[PDB]
Amino acid sequence: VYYNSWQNLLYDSNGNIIGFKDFVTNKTYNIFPCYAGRVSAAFHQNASSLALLYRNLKCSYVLNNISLTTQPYFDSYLGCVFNADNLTDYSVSSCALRMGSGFCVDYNSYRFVTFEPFNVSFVNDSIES
Amino acid sequence: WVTPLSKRQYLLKFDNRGVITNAVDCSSSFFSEIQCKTKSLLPNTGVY
Amino acid sequence: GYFPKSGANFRDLSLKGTTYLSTLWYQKPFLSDFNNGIFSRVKNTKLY
Amino acid sequence: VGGLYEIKIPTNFTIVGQEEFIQTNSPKVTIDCSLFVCSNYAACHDLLSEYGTFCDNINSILDEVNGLLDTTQLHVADTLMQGVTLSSNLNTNLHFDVDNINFKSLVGCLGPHCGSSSRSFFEDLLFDKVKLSDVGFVEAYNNCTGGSEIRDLLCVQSFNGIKVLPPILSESQISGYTTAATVAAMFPPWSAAAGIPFSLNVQYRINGLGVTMDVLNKNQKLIATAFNNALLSIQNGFSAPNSALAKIQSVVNSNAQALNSLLQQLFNKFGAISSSLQEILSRLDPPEAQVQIDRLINGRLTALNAYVSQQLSDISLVKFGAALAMEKVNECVKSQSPRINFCGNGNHILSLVQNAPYGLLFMHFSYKPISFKTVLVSPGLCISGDVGIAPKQGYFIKHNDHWMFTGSSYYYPEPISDKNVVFMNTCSVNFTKAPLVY
Amino acid sequence: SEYGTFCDNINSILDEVNGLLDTTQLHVADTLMQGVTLSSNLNTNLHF
Amino acid sequence: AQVQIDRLINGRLTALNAYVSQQLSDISLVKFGAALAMEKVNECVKSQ
Amino acid sequence: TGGSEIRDLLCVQSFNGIKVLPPILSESQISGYTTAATVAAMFPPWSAAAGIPFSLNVQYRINGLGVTMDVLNKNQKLIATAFNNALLSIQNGFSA
Ligand SMILES: *[C@@H]1O[C@H](CO)[C@@H](O[C@@H]2O[C@H](CO)[C@@H](O[C@@H]3O[C@H](CO)[C@@H](O)[C@H](O)[C@@H]3O)[C@H](O)[C@H]2NC(C)=O)[C@H](O)[C@H]1NC(C)=O
Ligand SMILES: *[C@@H]1O[C@H](CO)[C@@H](O[C@@H]2O[C@H](CO)[C@@H](O)[C@H](O)[C@H]2NC(C)=O)[C@H](O)[C@H]1NC(C)=O
Ligand SMILES: *[C@@H]1O[C@H](CO)[C@@H](O[C@@H]2O[C@H](CO)[C@@H](O)[C@H](O)[C@H]2NC(C)=O)[C@H](O)[C@H]1NC(C)=O
Ligand SMILES: *[C@@H]1O[C@H](CO)[C@@H](O)[C@H](O)[C@H]1NC(C)=O
Ligand SMILES: *[C@@H]1O[C@H](CO)[C@@H](O)[C@H](O)[C@H]1NC(C)=O
Ligand SMILES: *[C@@H]1O[C@H](CO)[C@@H](O)[C@H](O)[C@H]1NC(C)=O
Ligand SMILES: *[C@@H]1O[C@H](CO)[C@@H](O)[C@H](O)[C@H]1NC(C)=O
């Protein structure tokens, strides 16, 4: 509703264009940047392939808008993981491929597993006097 | 009422409908300089 | 941009006559230098 | 006056709680130097490749810095878990208070059957007031492809190659470690409480300040209620403009400010015709576009070197803070080291720890005098065959025209005995003469 | 002015540094004064 | 004059960034020294 | 701005925008705090000296090293003289 008769471009504080009104149709659009980002690749010297993490992307978005691949995939907490088996039920006390938030990539194929470096010592003695 | 124009730097504030509600002539006074430095009409409490 | 200087003065250059015109009305300081430009604030005199 | 001095000795007391946040971690900033300097523009990536290793150096320093943060977070978690032994019969759904002291708010879910719910009510109340924790950053970046009309600066930073990664251990794991370290003082084998019940440890710590045991073991209910009232006052204190919560928010704010300044460096012209590579490459051909783009490359690479040098300087302070927090876990929470103002100010009784965004929050509990009696005290007596005696953690006082001892932190006259005395084979000068004693 | 935020960054880092020094000097003075209780009868012109 | 002044501006801004990076490094050592002095006030002067 | 013919480098630095500001607490205030912390050991309630007279604190600290109490409370004048001689040696040692 903000475009007056002499106005056709919406700018931010930095001087990027972020919206416009089309001179022919008078339709109004917001402009958003196309997605840009890195791939976090985990590699082990004893392996022939990478485990790939697309941080904060759901696998449907990666496959539909970035690239199709033949590799198996799943939606982990950190984002879409390719070429690793979802085994967060399993746990490891040491990890060379630390992904964040207590998740680790382990290699035998790759596994995506939880990192739990410390334990409590347990005894079966009574708590009560 | 008439006053001279010249090439000057202003802070301009636009509201949520794109009207200029306020302005600051940055070199006109010490408080105007604090407003332009902080890009705000009411700077935070502090020593500048 | 081309803006007024904040804290400078406007001059009320309007003149109202009834019959006689003063020859001083057509000299400095009324006749004024344009330089870069001028900003005007004008009262709309709404008669009936 | 004679051999005696006027001293104010406490006649009543309470327990007071004091919060202390110590930063042990910071947001793991990672920069893609190539994406930051050149965006999607091939003509810039060509020129940037003729600068050679500068992006490799920026990436290598940031990877070292982030490895120092990861190693520090592991060393803090190791320090929390060191020596902790718990009973497998322990169930925090039923076991939450002992000896009239209530720990229900300090203890989360224990064991994996409850999942990531191991955050305590105290830690929940502390995390809910800080938007950009680790899970806060993960949710903000998850929303960048959500199609939302909200233009989050975190998304704009990430699309320009500036991103915060999650820490190697989630805050829910650390909250599990602070929960386990807390319950390790509550129940046998008491592995964090010197191998004795928590209330007895509190009682012996207060007695060590110069308070007679005879008041302590009759006032045990009043001491327990003072203790859990202090804990409730700490919890309620986060709703006010709390200095610990202000410090935690200042960690997030200083990070967000530094990233915002680094993003604003993309819009400086550095004496080129424009700050936009789109405008340069749509105005000039390669021979002149090169001259403009090279000014932008030098500006942006200078801004990255400045940001890197600031980041190295800041992470040195984060390592110093984490080393202090590990020292307080060891010498205030797991044990009571004989160091006066180390574990907070005043007559420090005992300390407890809870997880916090990018750090640990310690609660220090102190013996606080409420009211005082002015009394005349002797620092020593000369008795019998000029044998000297000095009081242990206390004073000699005249009571009913008879010499008696009192503890220095609580007025309670009790008879003089070898239990509360240091002997000397000769009394010093200006010790009060008392031939009738012993 | 075409280098934009460079001087703003220099000023911001030095203001942070000087705020760290000020906070440190307060914490040292607090550490000196912590727990100090003196008699109001004390007068160092006679008691030394 | 612009081409020459721009070399002076780059030289002087580079020198300020170097001085800033040195100042941050030095103040980290001042904080470490102050933390030690508070520890000595507590553990040598006010107690043993 | 005193009009002196002396060209102090601090003035040239300040006119080029380089200036040292004073600290938020003056060194006079800090010397007040160190004075207060010092007299807190001299007199009751002895709040910095573990709640006992300074000479007794000194004697007990020396005894803790493995010195019998008998020689300490017999030689108290010699100990006090050694102590204030050490303090004078520090003050005089600032002239070297
Ligand atoms: C000494 O041993 C006794 C018996 O083992 C302990 O007494 C128990 O103490 C708990 C508090 O920690 C009492 O819980 C209270 O229950 C009422 C409801 O009945 C509730 O309203 C209170 O808020 C509180 O939770 C418990 O009733 C009590 N049991 C008995 C049989 O007296 C005592 O704590 C031990 N320690 C000391 C220092 O006395
Ligand atoms: C797009 O918007 C413009 C501006 O409102 C429209 O042009 C005006 O249309 C009215 C009504 O026909 C005329 O009275 C004006 O003279 C036109 N010109 C201007 C500059 O106002 C235009 O008709 C709209 N077109 C469509 C397809 O919506
Ligand atoms: C990845 O693997 C984990 C572990 O097997 C899955 O988590 C379990 O999911 C089922 C069904 O929702 C729940 O009943 C369990 O309670 C979950 N366990 C845990 C530890 O959370 C997870 O669903 C898998 N995710 C994908 C996308 O494959
Ligand atoms: C930690 O506990 C789990 C479950 O009992 C076990 O698989 C793992 O080997 C333990 N690791 C260590 C370091 O104790
Ligand atoms: C505790 O564990 C030991 C070793 O398995 C066993 O001998 C003992 O019977 C157990 N006691 C209980 C109560 O489970
Ligand atoms: C100690 O102080 C509390 C709070 O004022 C009061 O309830 C209690 O009765 C007092 N006890 C004595 C012995 O004065
Ligand atoms: C992320 O997006 C969802 C849906 O719009 C919203 O409910 C949630 O509050 C958002 N969280 C953040 C941190 O933006």
Side-chain angles (χ1 to χ4, degrees), chain A residues 33 35-36 56, chain D residues 27 29-30 131-145 150-165 252-253 255-260 263 358:
Chain A
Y35 177 90
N56 315 105
Chain D
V29 185
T30 59
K131 191 183 184 74
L132 297 181
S133 61
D134 61 339
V135 302
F137 275 116
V138 170
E139 287 186 5
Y141 295 129
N142 284 0
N143 280 4
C144 296
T145 58
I150 305 303
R151 296 176 183 270
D152 191 340
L153 287 176
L154 294 180
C155 299
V156 183
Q157 287 167 13
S158 75
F159 295 166
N160 287 281
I162 304 172
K163 194 169 182 167
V164 173
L165 298 189
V252 173
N253 292 345
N255 177 71
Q257 161 165 341
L259 299 193
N260 183 56
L263 176 62
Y358 311 101

Side-chain angles (χ1 to χ4, degrees), chain G residues 8-30:
Chain G
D8 189 340
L9 288 175
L10 294 178
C11 297
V12 181
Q13 287 166 19
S14 76
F15 296 166
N16 287 278
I18 304 174
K19 194 169 181 167
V20 172
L21 297 188
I24 52 162
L25 300 176
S26 63
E27 293 284 11
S28 180
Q29 290 173 307
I30 309 303

